[PDB]
Design an enzyme around this catalytic site. Structure first.
Site, short mmCIF file in Angstrom:
data_model
loop_
_atom_site.label_atom_id
_atom_site.label_comp_id
_atom_site.label_asym_id
_atom_site.label_seq_id
_atom_site.Cartn_x
_atom_site.Cartn_y
_atom_site.Cartn_z
N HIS A 100 -0.17 -5.17 2.04
CA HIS A 100 -0.68 -3.93 2.73
C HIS A 100 -2.06 -4.28 3.69
O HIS A 100 -2.86 -3.31 3.55
CB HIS A 100 -0.92 -2.91 1.48
CG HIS A 100 0.46 -2.28 1.02
ND1 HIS A 100 0.34 -1.53 -0.09
CD2 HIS A 100 1.75 -2.65 1.53
CE1 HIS A 100 1.90 -1.60 -0.38
NE2 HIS A 100 2.61 -2.01 0.56
N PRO A 111 -12.20 0.01 -9.41
CA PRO A 111 -11.28 1.04 -10.11
C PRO A 111 -9.97 0.85 -9.16
O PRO A 111 -9.79 0.62 -8.04
CB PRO A 111 -11.79 2.08 -9.84
CG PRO A 111 -13.37 1.78 -9.75
CD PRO A 111 -13.26 0.55 -8.91
N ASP A 112 -8.71 1.18 -9.77
CA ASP A 112 -7.56 1.26 -9.30
C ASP A 112 -7.21 2.78 -8.51
O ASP A 112 -8.01 3.58 -8.29
CB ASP A 112 -6.31 0.90 -10.23
CG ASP A 112 -6.12 2.08 -11.31
OD1 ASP A 112 -6.45 3.19 -11.20
OD2 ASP A 112 -5.34 1.59 -12.40
N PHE A 113 -6.14 2.89 -8.17
CA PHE A 113 -5.82 4.25 -7.66
C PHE A 113 -5.18 5.35 -8.51
O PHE A 113 -5.44 6.59 -8.34
CB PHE A 113 -4.76 4.05 -6.54
CG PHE A 113 -5.18 3.14 -5.47
CD1 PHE A 113 -5.46 1.51 -5.71
CD2 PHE A 113 -5.43 3.75 -4.27
CE1 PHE A 113 -5.85 0.98 -4.48
CE2 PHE A 113 -5.92 2.83 -3.12
CZ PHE A 113 -6.04 1.48 -3.43
N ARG A 114 -4.22 5.03 -9.50
CA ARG A 114 -3.32 5.99 -10.36
C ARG A 114 -3.66 6.03 -11.70
O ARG A 114 -3.23 6.86 -12.49
CB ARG A 114 -1.89 5.78 -10.21
CG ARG A 114 -1.26 5.87 -8.63
CD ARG A 114 0.06 5.76 -8.64
NE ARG A 114 0.73 6.06 -7.41
CZ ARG A 114 0.51 5.20 -6.30
NH1 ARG A 114 -0.36 4.13 -6.32
NH2 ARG A 114 0.87 5.84 -4.95
N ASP A 158 -8.92 -5.89 -1.39
CA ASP A 158 -10.06 -6.42 -1.89
C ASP A 158 -10.26 -7.62 -1.50
O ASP A 158 -11.38 -8.29 -1.57
CB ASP A 158 -10.19 -6.19 -3.33
CG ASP A 158 -9.00 -6.83 -4.01
OD1 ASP A 158 -8.71 -7.67 -3.84
OD2 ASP A 158 -8.80 -6.01 -5.15
N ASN A 215 -3.18 -5.65 -2.99
CA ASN A 215 -4.63 -5.22 -2.94
C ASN A 215 -5.03 -5.86 -1.35
O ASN A 215 -4.83 -6.35 -0.74
CB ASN A 215 -4.99 -6.36 -3.96
CG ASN A 215 -4.76 -6.01 -5.33
OD1 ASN A 215 -3.97 -4.74 -5.57
ND2 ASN A 215 -5.01 -6.89 -6.26
C1 LIG Z 1 -13.55 -5.64 1.11
C2 LIG Z 1 -13.31 -4.10 0.50
C3 LIG Z 1 -14.17 -3.18 1.35
C4 LIG Z 1 -13.66 -1.95 0.80
C5 LIG Z 1 -14.18 -0.42 1.46
N1 LIG Z 1 -12.82 -1.67 -0.18
C6 LIG Z 1 -12.14 -2.87 -0.75
S1 LIG Z 1 -11.28 -2.56 -2.37
C7 LIG Z 1 -11.55 -0.85 -2.73
C8 LIG Z 1 -11.09 0.23 -2.30
O1 LIG Z 1 -10.11 0.94 -2.90
N2 LIG Z 1 -11.32 0.50 -0.98
C9 LIG Z 1 -10.60 1.73 -0.31
N3 LIG Z 1 -11.10 2.01 1.19
C10 LIG Z 1 -10.17 3.08 1.49
C11 LIG Z 1 -9.29 3.32 0.79
C12 LIG Z 1 -8.02 4.09 1.32
C13 LIG Z 1 -6.76 3.58 1.65
C14 LIG Z 1 -6.24 4.09 2.88
C15 LIG Z 1 -5.07 3.51 3.39
C16 LIG Z 1 -4.57 2.48 2.97
C17 LIG Z 1 -5.19 1.99 1.83
O2 LIG Z 1 -4.38 0.74 1.16
C18 LIG Z 1 -3.36 0.34 1.22
C19 LIG Z 1 -2.29 1.18 0.85
C20 LIG Z 1 -1.47 2.06 1.46
N4 LIG Z 1 -0.81 2.74 0.61
N5 LIG Z 1 -1.00 2.29 -0.76
N6 LIG Z 1 -2.06 1.43 -0.59
C21 LIG Z 1 -2.84 0.99 -1.63
O3 LIG Z 1 -2.41 1.85 -2.83
C22 LIG Z 1 -1.39 1.17 -3.73
C23 LIG Z 1 -2.06 1.19 -4.82
O4 LIG Z 1 -0.87 1.14 -5.80
P1 LIG Z 1 -0.83 -0.33 -6.94
O5 LIG Z 1 0.11 -0.37 -7.97
O6 LIG Z 1 -1.77 -1.35 -6.38
O7 LIG Z 1 -2.24 0.63 -8.05
P2 LIG Z 1 -1.78 1.63 -9.07
O8 LIG Z 1 -1.07 2.67 -8.46
O9 LIG Z 1 -3.30 2.26 -9.23
O10 LIG Z 1 -1.33 1.29 -10.45
C24 LIG Z 1 -2.40 -0.01 -10.81
C25 LIG Z 1 -1.48 -0.21 -12.11
O11 LIG Z 1 -2.01 -1.25 -12.93
C26 LIG Z 1 -2.27 -0.87 -14.34
N7 LIG Z 1 -3.70 -1.39 -14.86
C27 LIG Z 1 -4.78 -1.01 -14.28
N8 LIG Z 1 -5.71 -1.73 -14.80
C28 LIG Z 1 -4.98 -2.96 -15.44
C29 LIG Z 1 -5.35 -4.02 -16.26
N9 LIG Z 1 -6.70 -4.29 -16.23
N10 LIG Z 1 -4.53 -4.58 -16.88
C30 LIG Z 1 -3.45 -4.32 -16.69
N11 LIG Z 1 -2.78 -3.12 -15.93
C31 LIG Z 1 -3.66 -2.41 -15.50
C32 LIG Z 1 -2.40 0.67 -14.29
O12 LIG Z 1 -1.75 1.23 -15.34
C33 LIG Z 1 -1.04 0.93 -13.05
O13 LIG Z 1 0.19 0.67 -13.64
C34 LIG Z 1 -1.23 -0.10 -3.13
O14 LIG Z 1 0.08 -0.33 -2.33
C35 LIG Z 1 -2.45 -0.45 -2.33
O15 LIG Z 1 -2.21 -1.32 -0.94
C36 LIG Z 1 -6.34 2.38 1.25
S2 LIG Z 1 -9.04 2.25 -1.01
N12 LIG Z 1 -12.59 -4.20 -0.54
#
Ligand SMILES: Cc1cc(C)nc(SCC(=O)Nc2ncc(Cc3cccc(OCc4cnnn4[C@H]4O[C@H](COP(=O)(O)OP(=O)(O)OC[C@H]5O[C@@H](n6cnc7c(N)ncnc76)[C@H](O)[C@@H]5O)[C@@H](O)[C@H]4O)c3)s2)n1
Ligand SMILES: [Zn+2]
Length: 300
Positions: A132, A39-42, A115, A113
């Protein structure tokens, strides 16, 4: 002066097939991994930001903040257990970026990402800026030590719900992701300065462009460079409002009467990439690549 003959996916495919389009930069976020079961974040209700209340944070962003992590790491590691992917199978979108690599069109993939799916799909370290960071490796936080630990070690600590401590010095061990408040990898700046001089096409997929300085990248491209957004909804627009992420002036123009280079294809990333591949004559290549890589993963 206008490089796309029309502001559509077909216009972008024809541009891609011309000789001016040699260097493609991809900018990707969590949307390109949601069809992989992560799953995504927002997104409302399923995204992380709507699932933080149970961690009893002083505010939801605390779990992303380096100074909070250093003081209270236990929420982060509980969340890490909750969100640990049950499988690591990259998506059609990932393999499309791999096809762009194999065909010599990928100048760089800048990913937010964590992941590691870009690596598993076959993008090599030279092809990638993990802007990131990733969960792939972890480091003790003590500057005098900085011992490295692999994902298998970190995984064991996460699932056993033991806060990871360094085996040499007993300081905290942090995954190599970039927290709020931390500097980005130096590779990010070195590559940005070289890549965005050369880029002929900017592909933005699966990101809300809500995090700086990553979101500034769309403004680093030359003003004639076409920009294609494949996303469930428009993002990174230049329209000014209080709380906009973009610096004033920068941002995408899909709809004004001055629009000249920005295209929004609104839908699922996998479908948009499949449609683009089909328009390029790559649909079977991409389908076979996904099938073969997915079967290879399914064997173990
Ligand atoms: C190997 C492994 C081990 C583990 C344990 N875990 C994973 S992995 C799973 C995961 O989470 N683990 C987590 N553990 C801890 C976490 C907390 C954390 C703490 C500190 C930093 C972190 O991380 C870096 C960071 C810093 N500050 N921010 N960040 C991150 O957060 C930002 C998100 O921003 P982004 O733009 O990527 O995502 P959104 O805001 O949700 O937008 C999505 C858009 O896609 C659209 N949409 C959706 N689906 C669609 C589809 N199918 N088709 C077309 N459109 C689609 C939707 O409509 C929207 O427009 C980013 O900067 C990122 O680095 C994290 S999290 N792997
Ligand atoms: Zn240490």
């Amino acid at each position: 002066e206008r490089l796309l003959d029309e502001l559509t996916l077909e216009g972008v495919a024809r541009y891609m097939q011309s000789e001016r389009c040699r260097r493609v930069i991809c900018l990707v976020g969590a949307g390109i991994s949601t069809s992989a079961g992560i799953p995504d974040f927002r997104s409302p209700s399923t995204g992380l930001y709507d699932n933080l209340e149970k961690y009893h944070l002083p505010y939801p962003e605390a779990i992303f903040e380096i100074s909070y992590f250093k003081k209270h790491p236990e929420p982060f590691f509980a969340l890490a257990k909750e969100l640990y992917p049950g499988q690591f199978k990259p998506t059609i979108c990932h393999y499309f970026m791999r096809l762009l690599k194999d065909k010599g069109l990928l100048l760089r993939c800048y990913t937010q990402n964590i992941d590691t799916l870009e690596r598993i799909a076959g993008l090599e370290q030279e092809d990638l800026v993990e802007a990131h960071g990733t969960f792939y490796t972890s480091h003790c936080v003590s500057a005098s030590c900085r011992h490295e630990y692999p994902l298998s070690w970190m995984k064991e600590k996460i699932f056993s719900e033991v806060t990871p401590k360094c085996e040499d010095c007993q300081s905290l061990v942090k995954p190599d992701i970039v927290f709020f408040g931390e500097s980005l990898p130096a590779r990010f700046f070195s590559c940005m300065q070289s890549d965005f001089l050369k880029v002929d096409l900017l592909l933005v997929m699966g990101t809300s462009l809500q995090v700086q300085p990553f979101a500034s990248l769309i403004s680093k491209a030359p003003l004639s460079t076409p920009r294609l957004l494949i996303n469930k909804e428009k993002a990174g627009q230049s329209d000014p409002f209080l709380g906009m992420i973009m610096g004033l002036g920068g941002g995408m123009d899909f709809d004004s009467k001055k629009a000249y280079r920005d295209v929004a294809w609104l839908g699922e990333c996998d479908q948009g990439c499949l449609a683009l591949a089909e328009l390029l004559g790559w649909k079977k290549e991409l389908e076979d690549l996904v099938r073969r890589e997915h079967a290879s993963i399914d064997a173990q």
